[PDB]
Amino acid sequence: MNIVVLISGNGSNLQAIIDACKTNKIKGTVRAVFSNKADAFGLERARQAGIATHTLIASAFDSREAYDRELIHEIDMYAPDVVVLAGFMRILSPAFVSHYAGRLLNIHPSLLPKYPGLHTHRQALENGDEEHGTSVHFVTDELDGGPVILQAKVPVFAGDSEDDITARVQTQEHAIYPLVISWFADGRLKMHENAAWLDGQRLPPQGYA
């Protein structure tokens, strides 16, 4: 089972995934890590793990379509069974989403449908929500509109800073992402009729309950 991970920054989720393959919780391997930022430390994590790395700079391309095309061309050298977005700060084109339909995953730092887009933690905190979390879902063209597979809620108390809750959510992300990937790896997770299904059963709008 071949996994290709796409990142943009630190890659703590990438690390959790790497560790899960190592323990075999996930019966597969991370074949490659792609980044749109040369600096991403995640690349360094993959490097140290003997995993291949690649970098595609948006400037070197003259259109989003041209960029994803070279992305698809590159990612495919590894014959991935699933493409995983772990902190990938770049919106993917419909062509790309199409090419990996049903095998493209992402983990959004909020309790979807709440706060699609960037700056989740802040909104959650500035709006005064008593509950925050993360959501792993199948990627569709709709910015975080795809079928939610699993969420991990997290209590928000007075006094918690943006970083406090962020580190709290992160801890959950490291737990549910590798898990969702393992479900996928065992052919227990699929998507059709634009819905997420676990063990053959349809999952609710907010993921496995």
Ligand X SMILES: NCC(=O)N[C@@H]1O[C@H](COP(=O)([O-])[O-])[C@@H](O)[C@H]1O
Binding residues: 11-13, 64, 89-92, 106, 140-144, 170-173
Residue range at the interface with ligand NHS (CB under 6 A); choices 24-32, 47-55, 74-82, 143-151: 143-151
Using CB under 6 A as the binding rule, whether residue 35 contacts ligand NHS is answered as no
CA-wise closest residue to 134 among 192, 91, 175: 175
Using CB under 6 A as the binding rule, whether residue 74 contacts ligand NHS is answered as no
- For the chain, the 3-state helix, strand and coil shares in percent, each to the nearest 5, are 35, 25, 40
Regarding beta strands 201-202 and 189-192, do their DSSP bridges make them parallel or antiparallel, or are they unpaired?
unpaired
**8-state DSSP, 203:** P
**8-state DSSP, 131:** E
Q: Which does 13 bind (CB under 5 to 8 A by kind): ligand NHS, a copy of itself, ligand X, none?
A: ligand X
Q: Which does 165 bind (CB under 5 to 8 A by kind): a copy of itself, ligand NHS, ligand X, none?
A: none
CB nearer ligand X, residue 77 or residue 118: 118
* Position among 12, 124, 144, 156 found at the interface with ligand NHS (CB under 6 A): 144
* Position among 49, 89, 175, 198 found at the interface with ligand NHS (CB under 6 A): 89
Using CB under 8 A as the binding rule, whether residue 130 contacts a copy of itself is answered as no
Using CB under 8 A as the binding rule, whether residue 204 contacts a copy of itself is answered as yes
List the Cα angle 106/108/112 in 5-degree steps. 115
| Interface of this chain with a copy of itself, residues 58 to 117, rule: CB under 8 A | 113-114
On the CB side of 135, how many CA atoms lie within 13 Å of its CA?
28
- Nearest residue to ligand NHS, using CB? 91
How far apart are CB 202 and a copy of itself at their closest, in Å? 5
In the chain, which residue ranges form alpha helices assigned H by DSSP? 12-22, 41-48, 64-75, 94-99, 120-127, 162-185
State both tokens at 69. Answer: 């095309």
Q: Which residues contact 132 (CB under 8 A, 6 or more apart)?
A: 110, 111, 120, 121, 124, 125, 153, 154, 156, 165, 169
Q: Is 174 a catalytic residue?
A: no
CB nearer a copy of itself, residue 188 or residue 192: 192
Q: Virtual CA dihedral for 206, 122, 141, 30, nearest 10 degrees?
A: -80
Residues catalogued as catalytic? 108
Q: Which residues bind a copy of itself (CB under 8 A)?
A: 113-114, 193-195, 201-206, 209
Residues of this chain that interact with ligand NHS (CB under 6 A) are 85, 88-92, 97, 106, 108, 117-118, 139, 141, 143-144, 146
